[PDB]
Design a binder for this molecule. Structure first.
Ligand SMILES: [Cu+2]
Length: 129
């Protein structure tokens, strides 16, 4: 929605958008994550983490090991292009990142690194015009 997108997660490990396209006129892009469920963040919190499709399992494992105070993302993790905070039901969070961190054509993985969620709660991001 110009250089912005909103994506929702509910009380299942699902994003409502499975693919996001960043328009090639965008220098910055903003993701608004909303958790439209009603469950607590220690029970079913969710975040949105963007990495190259390669770095997903590695970031997810180190992310799980980082703990909730770190929003389940390793601090200063060089492989993380952008990430939101972990939010609970009824909350939302946004993150804006620079599109020149993305190579054209190339597919990126966005996923949730809350414990146990990475393999299910995931999607694809690509740059296109
Ligand atoms: Cu999740």
């Amino acid at each position: 929605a110009q250089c912005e997108a909103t994506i929702e997660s509910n009380d299942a490990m699902q994003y409502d958008l499975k693919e996001m396209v960043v328009d090639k006129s965008c220098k910055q892009f903003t993701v608004h994550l909303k958790h439209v469920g009603k469950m607590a963040k220690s029970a079913m919190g969710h975040n949105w983490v963007l990495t190259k499709e390669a770095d997903k399992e590695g970031v997810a494992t180190d992310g799980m090991n980082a703990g909730l105070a770190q929003d389940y993302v390793k601090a200063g993790d060089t492989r993380v292009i952008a990430h939101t905070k972990v939010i609970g039901g009824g909350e939302s969070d946004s993150v804006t990142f620079d599109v020149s961190k993305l190579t054209p054509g190339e597919a990126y993985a966005y996923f949730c690194s809350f414990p146990g969620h990475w393999a299910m709660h995931k999607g694809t991001l690509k740059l296109s015009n």
